[PDB]
Every structure is written in structure tokens, then in C-alpha cells.
Chain A
């Protein structure tokens, strides 16, 4: 997990692409796995009581319900979240270009997985907040709503939602992103 999130995804913007489509495809890869990972995560009070396992003689904490870490990363200002938002803004602009094939199909599927993970976090967030509030990790989570009105770094203001809307302008060309967005 750390290998993928710190070394691959979070760096995917800093890597040089001889084939530009590669940046998009690699983001697509990382996203697919993170997505499936969260998609199975069921919030349980077991995740927030740090289970102690005797591994190699040292008591290490057992991993929580698989998505919990990802959720903690999405429920806080993690570079992961801002990267999601940045890919979002960049896709919005690229769409606004109304430009041919280059990296496209991968770009679409990427942003689509992103929207999917967003919907999933929103979906589970109710029970996840209930459980965390019941087991009390000092970890502070904010419901994804308040974060979505976040002030975008590039935009310098809360245009995450507005950008998210703007894809609705591209409906007649892209039905898929429109569906996800409206969801």
C-alpha cells in the first residue's frame, strides 16, 4: 500500500513520460487498486481498536478494515486528496480543450474511477463516522462535504464543485463523466 501510494501515485506527476498517455495510464492503474480496496471496506468497530499481534516477537497493530487507511487519507488533507482534486481540475481543463485522442480513453477511465471513489467515500462516510465516533481514534475526520467546498490550490477558491459541474457541459460528448458527476 505505502509502495503504491507514496512511491507511484503521489509521484506520478513528477515522472517523465516519453509517451504522455503513460502518466494517465499509471494513474489509472493506481486508482483501480485503491478503488477496489475501498469498495470492499466495511466500517466496523474492530478497525478502530488497535488489535495487537505478536509478529516477529514485537506487538504490532493489525491492519484495520482494508479501506480504513485510505479513508483516513481521504478524510484529511492528504496529498492523495489534493492529487485527486488536481487530476480533477486538469481533466476538466483538458476536456474544455475539446481535443482529440491523446491519452483520452485512459484519461476518461481515470477520472471516472476517481468519481467512483468519491461516491464510495460519501456512501460509507455515515457509518464510518458513526463507528469512529464510537471507538474514538483521536484522528479527526471531516465529512467529504466540507472538504469538497475546499479552496482549490490552482483556483485559489472553492471551485471544486463548480469544476465538477463543468463536466456536465461536456455531456453530449461524454455521457459517462456526466453520469458520475450528477451522481
Chain B
């Protein structure tokens, strides 16, 4: 039964593990999109200045 539980907990830990790197992947892609929105903002600010 300990073999059973340890294998299942291994699935659980691997799951949380991959999920952490995936949420970090979203955290990266979202800062990437946070920079292009800033690019659009900069242009909007320039238009307002004009």
C-alpha cells in the first residue's frame, strides 16, 4: 500500500512541478505582452504630445 501511495504522490508532485513551469511560462509571455502594450502606449503618448 505504501508503494501505491508513493507512486500516486509521485504523479501529484510531477503534476505540480510541470504546472509551476507552465505558470512561469505564462508569467513570461505576459510580460512579453506587457512590453508591446507599452510600445503602443509610447506611440499614443507621442500622438498626444503632437
Contacts and interface: CB of A to CB of B under 8 A. Distances in A.
Contacts of A157: 20-21, 24
Nearest to A81: B31
Interface string B32-44: 0011000000000
Interface of B: 20-21, 24, 27-28, 30-31, 34-35, 49
A151 B21 contact: yes
A82 B27 CA distance: 12
Interface string A26-58: 000000000000000000000000000000001
A156 B28 contact: no
A77 B34 contact: yes
A58 B46 CA distance: 13
A15 to B, nearest CB: 19
B35 A151 contact: no
Contact of B24 (A78, A79, A82, A156): A156
Contacts of A156: 21, 24
